[PDB]
Amino acid sequence: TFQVVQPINGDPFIGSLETPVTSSPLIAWYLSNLPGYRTAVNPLLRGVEVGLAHGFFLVGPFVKAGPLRNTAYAGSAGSLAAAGLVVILSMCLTIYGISSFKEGEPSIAPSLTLTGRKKQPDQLQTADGWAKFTGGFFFGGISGVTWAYFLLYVLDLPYF
């Protein structure tokens, strides 16, 4: 009889299961194309994309819910707060990278695909790769915050 849920990769002794939420073709395609999962690309470029996307979002909540939301200084204060949060997150990423990775060691990413094919391990799991990722993320986040502020308060676009 047809059954949907199966053990992970056919091994019933590994602590996971394969469900439509995890292994649907649409879901599998969507996750494989996000920057965090492009193991064959320069980490700087993935970090720049992640920073751009995350910095663009942060402006909205700070602007709209902030203590100066009902004043003429709403946009500038919100954007400045978003930039500060981006700076704090960049500091956290740098600290994590320094703590976790040692210079000169090989990558610790897995080198086996789900079908058993051998692949080159991800370079994001090295000190140099994480440093590039963090420096891309900072530059991306600042650029996204600036773009959001520019669009919202330099061009009088019919938003809302």
Binding site: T1, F2, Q3, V4, V5, G15, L17, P67
Partner: protein, 737 residues
């Protein structure tokens, strides 16, 4: 199928305590034996492994329970006939407080016999028996005396049946496992026939007597109930359709009975309760529905359903074999059935508590505020306790009766193979709800303290409107004439129709608005319920094994720990998960009852003047004051506790004494909860030393309480103290105002 004289009736076993257990029957070497005697008294499974004996033992105890209930009912009916002011209250329900208990003057305690009206002195009762008796047509004390006598006779009958069905004719195991016949009988006969009989009583007794009472007739001038039966002319005068007899019923001319079988809806303006004709029609329809439903399952005549056949046919691509095998589990285990029934009964009790306040079913009940509050709180607590017991017995079944080699079920097996995902998701949901429900109260407190009222989540600064509940209210308010054409008014006055019902200068019911505070309190309720469900479901799902202790099923259901190893293993058994969930159930129910009390006193209850202006008890401060913790501390706990702390020297001083007594009992429980056994066992050694010095050392060696016993004592005292404190506070507050 029964057995003739299986067990001899004798006093021999009375003189040998612990005869039900081999270990306990040896003798009391230490004091732990005495405690072990009471804890294992009703665990029939541990006594014997024969299912027939366990079933026979279980069947007989329910007869004793029924006998005790009948004795309680007999006492309740007798006290109303002998020590009550019911007949005076019946002539003026709005100005006389019901009372059915009186006190002997001994040590100055006759001060508790305060005035209640009608030339009577006693203790005011809040159980609502007066309204129950009034709605039944009871007028004199002779009827109550007869009812008490009948209840005593029924208690004696139940006791005799309990003795008989265990010592003279005990049914066989095949009799118990006939679930189809039991379901058919309990549906068609127990419920359907009972509903039909109550409908007949309401048709022939309650309707005419209550019509005479509502008309304003002196209760002593109303004809007796049997006069309406022997004299059809009286009923014809009251209801002309009775002149045609039962002919409209058999000719399908049912519309002629519209005089006493209505579909009005709303409340009776004179009494403030539901129309009795609607209740009679409701009971008739329910009796028909239950009588039809009792012909579903197969028996000796071949027609009907087989429960096993229905279960085996429900399977899917996600669940494998489905419900196959569940029929054998539920016909061989008493604990699983007990857990299921406990959960359903607790949910039903909570539903009943919610329903009785918004649709008052008894005359002069809505305007008796103390009775409403007491009934709501009582039934909420009962439902919570039953719900916790459900999980307890589910864990017991998982530990003891689970056996996949002979009782395999695919649905239960699949749940146990992904329990980590369930527990982790529930953990995240609980954390999210706690952050986004209680955090909004802390934000409000901080903003108010800092002097920034325009940054609060409130109806004036940042609104969080519960638009989903308001839509439901609007849909239910406009139902008559659109989606319920046969109805005249809405089901309840709370939906927001706009009408007000006032009885004797007091407000009975009116629309209840919803705003920002209701949003927050409802999410608080959701958070607490979710946390309780987390603690109980984790306890059930990890009863047999975990990554920490693979062999947990070998240690049993009720064990304290597995030692200080693995970093420490205190509270790993399934019993400890019920012990921890009792505290969260208490928390949730306390919050719910506080919400009910404040909302009712602020937005509903009050007095009405001649010009039509309503003055509520607390003046509608719930909307703006309940959005902060300081508001709850100040405008609810501080302000409304003045009644209970000023009750000394009056008839309400018993509540004042109980307030402090329950405080003491609650505080006394923390000694057992914060400390451990080794200290107390070491301390006893020094006390025993001086008893040996004076030759007064007992032969039964004193021992400290066990780890489980200490946990149980602590939780019991904690719950008793808290609930008693809230009880005294509520009663003292609501009787005065």
């Amino acid at each position: 199928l029964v057995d003739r004289d299986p067990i001899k009736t004798s006093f021999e076993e009375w003189a040998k305590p612990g005869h039900f257990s081999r270990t306990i029957a040896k003798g009391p070497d230490t004091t732990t034996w005495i405690w072990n005697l009471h804890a294992d008294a009703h665990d029939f499974d541990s006594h014997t492994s024969d299912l027939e004996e366990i079933s026979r033992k279980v069947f007989s105890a329910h007869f004793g329970q029924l006998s005790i209930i009948f004795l309680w009912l007999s006492g309740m009916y007798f006290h109303g006939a002998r020590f009550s002011n019911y007949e005076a209250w019946l002539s003026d329900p709005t100005h006389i407080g019901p009372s059915a208990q009186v006190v002997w003057p001994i040590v100055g305690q006759e001060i508790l016999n305060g005035d209640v009206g009608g030339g009577f002195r006693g203790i005011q009762i809040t159980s609502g028996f007066f309204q129950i008796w009034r709605a039944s047509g009871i007028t004199s004390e002779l009827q109550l005396y007869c009812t008490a006598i009948g209840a005593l006779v029924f208690a004696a009958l139940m006791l005799f049946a309990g003795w008989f069905h265990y010592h003279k004719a005990a049914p066989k195991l095949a009799w118990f496992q006939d679930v189809e016949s039991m379901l058919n009988h309990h549906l068609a006969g127990l419920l359907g026939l009972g509903s039909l009989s109550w409908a007949g009583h309401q048709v022939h007794v309650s309707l005419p007597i209550n019509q005479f009472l509502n008309a304003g007739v002196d209760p002593k001038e109303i004809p007796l109930p049997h006069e309406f039966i022997l004299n059809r002319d009286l009923l014809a005068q009251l209801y002309p359709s009775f002149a045609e007899g039962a002919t409209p019923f058999f000719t399908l001319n049912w519309s002629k009975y519209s005089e006493f079988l209505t579909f009005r809806g709303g409340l009776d303006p004179v009494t403030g309760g539901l129309w009795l004709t609607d209740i009679a029609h409701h009971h008739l329809a329910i009796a028909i529905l239950f009588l039809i439903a009792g012909h579903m399952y197969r028996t000796n005549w071949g027609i009907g359903h087989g429960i096993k056949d229905i279960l085996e046919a429900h399977k899917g691509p996600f669940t494998g074999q489905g419900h196959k095998g569940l029929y054998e589990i539920l016909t061989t285990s008493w604990h699983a059935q007990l857990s299921l029934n406990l959960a359903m009964l607790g949910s039903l009790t909570i539903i009943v508590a919610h329903h009785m306040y918004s649709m008052p079913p008894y005359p002069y009940l809505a305007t008796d505020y103390a009775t409403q509050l007491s009934l709501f709180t009582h039934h909420m607590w009962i439902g919570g306790f039953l719900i916790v017991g459900a999980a307890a017995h589910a864990a017991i079944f998982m530990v003891r009766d689970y056996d996949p080699t002979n009782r395999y079920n695919d649905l239960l097996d699949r749940v146990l193979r992904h329990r980590d995902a369930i527990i982790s998701h529930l953990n995240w949901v609980c954390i999210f709800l706690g952050f986004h429900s209680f955090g909004l109260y802390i934000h409000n407190d901080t903003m108010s303290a800092l002097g920034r009222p325009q940054d609060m989540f409130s109806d004036t600064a940042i609104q969080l409107q519960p638009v989903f509940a308001q839509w439901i209210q609007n849909t239910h308010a406009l139902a008559p004439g659109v989606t319920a054409p046969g109805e005249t008014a809405s089901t309840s006055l709370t939906w927001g129709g706009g009408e007000l019902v006032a009885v004797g200068g007091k407000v009975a019911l009116l629309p209840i608005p919803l705003g920002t505070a209701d949003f927050l309190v409802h999410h608080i309720h959701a958070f607490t319920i979710h946390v309780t469900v987390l603690i109980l479901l984790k306890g059930v799902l990890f009863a047999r094994s975990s990554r920490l202790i693979p062999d947990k099923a070998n240690l049993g259901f009720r064990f304290p720990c597995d030692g200080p190893g693995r970093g420490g293993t205190c509270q790993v058994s399934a019993w400890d998960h019920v012990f921890l969930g009792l505290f969260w159930m208490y928390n949730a129910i306390s919050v719910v009852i506080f919400h009910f009390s404040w909302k009712m006193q602020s937005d509903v209850w009050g007095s009405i003047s001649d010009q039509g202006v309503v003055t509520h008890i607390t003046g509608g401060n719930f909307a703006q004051s309940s959005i902060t913790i300081n508001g709850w501390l100040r405008d609810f706990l501080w302000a409304q506790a003045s009644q209970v702390i000023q009750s000394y020297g009056s008839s309400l001083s018993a509540y004042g004494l109980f307030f402090l007594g329950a405080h003491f009992v609650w505080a006394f429980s923390l000694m057992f909860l914060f400390s451990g056994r080794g200290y107390w066992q070491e301390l006893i050694e020094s006390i025993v030393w001086a008893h040996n010095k004076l030759k007064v050392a007992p032969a039964t060696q004193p021992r400290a309480l066990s780890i489980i016993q200490g946990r149980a004592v602590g939780v019991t005292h904690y719950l008793l103290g808290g609930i008693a404190t809230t009880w005294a506070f509520f009663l003292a507050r609501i009787i005065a105002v």
